[PDB]
């Protein structure tokens, strides 16, 4: 899989 | 939630 | 549509 990143600021990865 | 970003170029945020 | 990017490292685009 691979990691997408979002801005919460903190950077959060999300595995997909 | 948090904001993911895509390239349209313009940068577009998407709230999730 | 627009391209989101993930980290695999390689950078991978995903069209949405
Ligand atoms: Cl995750
Ligand atoms: Cl949004
Ligand atoms: Cl694609």
Q: Could you describe the 3D structure shown?
A:
Chain A is built from no helices and two strands. Helix content of chain A is 0%, strand content 62%. Chain A is mainly beta and 16 residues long. A two-stranded antiparallel sheet of chain A has the order 1-2. Chain A has strands at 3-7, 11-15. In chain A, a hairpin with a 3-residue loop joins β1 (3-7) and β2 (11-15). Chain A binds chain B through residues 4-8, 12, and chain B through 1-5, 13, 16. β1 of chain B pairs antiparallel with β1 (3-7) of chain C, so a sheet runs across the interface. The complex binds chloride ion (3 copies). The site of one chloride ion has 2 residues of chain A, from β2. The PDB classes it as de novo protein. The entry lists the keywords amyloid, oligomer, Alzheimer's, trimer, protein fibril, DE novo protein. The assembly is trimeric. The entry is titled "X-ray crystallographic structure of a covalent trimer derived from A-beta 17_36. Synchrotron data set. (ORN)CVFFCED(ORN)AII(SAR)L(ORN)V". Chains A, B, C are 16mer A-beta peptide: ORN-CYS-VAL-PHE-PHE-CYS-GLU-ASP-ORN-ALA-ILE-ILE-SAR-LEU-ORN-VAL.
């Amino acid at each position: 899989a691979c990691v997408f990143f979002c801005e919460d600021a903190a950077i959060i990865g999300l595995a997909v």
